């Protein structure tokens with residue numbers, strides 16, 4: 183069982199710039215009928231993986247010449263001449279030298295764009311959910327960049343750590359931005375025991391956290 | 402056109418067995434080597450098994466002895482028999498055709514999902530997400546839908562049956578203690594809501610559940 187190491191885990195690149203992804207095999211590649219069993223795949227958001235390069239440097243039909251593969255002995259590199267928005271997604275190298283063939287851990291190619299702060303929205307629990315004893319406060323943070331972001335939940339002023347559920351979307355190819363959802367779940371009993379609810383978002387774009395909130399006792 | 406389509410995935414209890422199918426079309430079924438590759442939550446890809454035109458089969462260590470890949474040349478269907486299913490088997494299973502010989506994995510299908518767990522199928526609860534009154538009004542307004550407490554994946558969400566498709570952000574489900582929660586937001590001109598209806602449609606195949614939730618502005622008497 184060989185081991186295929188891929189670098190880096192994330193590769194931010196500006197459109198027009200060059201992308202470089204590499205894979206090292208914990209063992210010298212075992213040639214097959216001469217050629218090297220090295221291949222590269224791209225899985226775009228919500229799509230199945232697809233073949234880009236095989237035999238280490240051969241372009242599967244349909245793949246732009248902007249894509250090229252090279253390398254030798256345990257060291258192999260995927261290069262994208264001038265990255266285009268549509269290249270966005272996760273790349274994988276494949277080493278089928280021996281059974282079992284192995285995949286690198288993948289590299290998320292990220293399109294670099296101008297920093298953009300999130301449009302934040304907060305939503306109190308719904309009547310229907312309260313009637314059921316639950317209480318979830320929701321905060322949407324949409325269309326921002328970079329992806330790194332801090333979201334703090336404050337109830338009546340104090341920071342709540344337990345009961346939060348965050349989720350990010352993949353990077354959108356249309357605008358290169360990320361969107362995120364943060365859900366604070368509580369008991370109906372507690373929600374009604376406090377008044378103020380706020381999600382604070384700290385984003386590179388501002389030392390001033392963007393804040394959104396509401397009072398449980400209002401409209 | 403080459404086309405491979407997976408089916409058979411679903412929720413199964415550990416130790417259980419499940420057989421996956423992959424319908425092939427557009428080529429000489431027995432001519433190429435067919436493989437099964439799975440993708441775990443961490444999006445990592447792991448080769449599962451392959452069967453070459455020679456009939457010879459191969460498996461990955463974790464699979465060996467539990468899974469069996471086979472083909473019905475006549476019906477043009479590739480199978481993957483699974484047994485002693487471990488939690489570790491939960492993943493999206495894809496079948497692919499070699500480009501030729503032992504070179505490349507192409508025409509992967511959309512995949513079929515396999516969830517191995519003890520938790521029981523649970524219908525989602527769909528809650529509407531309405532703003533805070535009106536005072537905070539710009540030209541746009543963002544609404545949403547919370548879908549929580551369902552199991553297993555997947556669930557689908559659409560807005561206005563699909564009529565509303567722009568300005569939507571649906572977030573990947575998060576599993577918190579045997580139950581998933583997912584949310585979807587939509588932004589529309591503040592002048593069109595609540596004048597015109599905004600409803601999210603949520604479907605959960607696993608439980609044959611289908612719910613439409615109208616987003617109504619907060620009580621406010």
Ligand SMILES: C[C@]12CC[C@H]3[C@@H](CCC4=CC(=O)CC[C@@]43C)[C@@H]1CC[C@@H]2O
Pocket residue numbers: 278279280281283434435436451452453459497498499500502503504505506507
């Ligand atoms: C999976 C695959 C078909 C099965 C091939 C694999 C290359 C390595 C290999 C060596 C063997 O001895 C059996 C067949 C396998 C396991 C090929 C890589 C691409 C192709 O689709």
